Design a protein around this ligand. Structure first.
Ligand SMILES: *[C@@H]1O[C@H](CO)[C@@H](O)[C@H](O)[C@H]1NC(C)=O
Ligand SMILES: *[C@@H]1O[C@H](CO)[C@@H](O)[C@H](O)[C@H]1NC(C)=O
Ligand SMILES: [Cl-]
Length: 113
């Protein structure tokens, strides 16, 4: 089974395997597709972060690098950074995935508008 953000922010969810190992770029893309989603772009993750989305996991985006959205600094998440922090790693490296749902119309899929 996959782990997924319960509430998507600006259409974005963190998607991971339930246990290690995580996913190379191809595998992350395929996880999003299996859910009927696409791999999110860096811009989509940034829009989510600007509406309150943060995680402590690096995940693939469509630009073929990994990102982490951070609002609060934490030494163990994005090396204490804030914003959407980038890790340029080979496509073979394992990360989670950021997926985007183009059908979402709410800022937070758990907060009705
Ligand atoms: C990614 O993982 C798949 C296994 O699901 C493998 O077939 C593929 O070669 C891997 N790609 C890279 C670049 O390591
Ligand atoms: C995608 O968003 C639509 C509309 O909010 C929702 O009905 C659907 O369940 C979502 N699917 C996933 C996999 O997030
Ligand atoms: Cl959407």
């Amino acid at each position: 089974d996959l782990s997924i953000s319960t509430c998507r922010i600006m259409g974005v969810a963190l998607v991971g395997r339930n246990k290690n190992p995580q996913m190379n770029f191809t595998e992350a893309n395929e996880a999003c597709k299996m859910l009927g989603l696409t791999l999110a772009s860096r811009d989509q993750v940034e829009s989510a972060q600007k509406s309150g989305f943060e995680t402590c996991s690096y995940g693939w985006v469509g630009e073929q690098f990994s990102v982490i959205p951070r609002i609060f600094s934490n030494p163990r998440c994005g090396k204490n950074g804030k914003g959407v922090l980038i890790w340029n790693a080979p496509s073979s490296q394992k990360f989670k995935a950021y997926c985007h749902n183009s059908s979402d119309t709410w800022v937070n899929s758990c907060i009705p508008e």
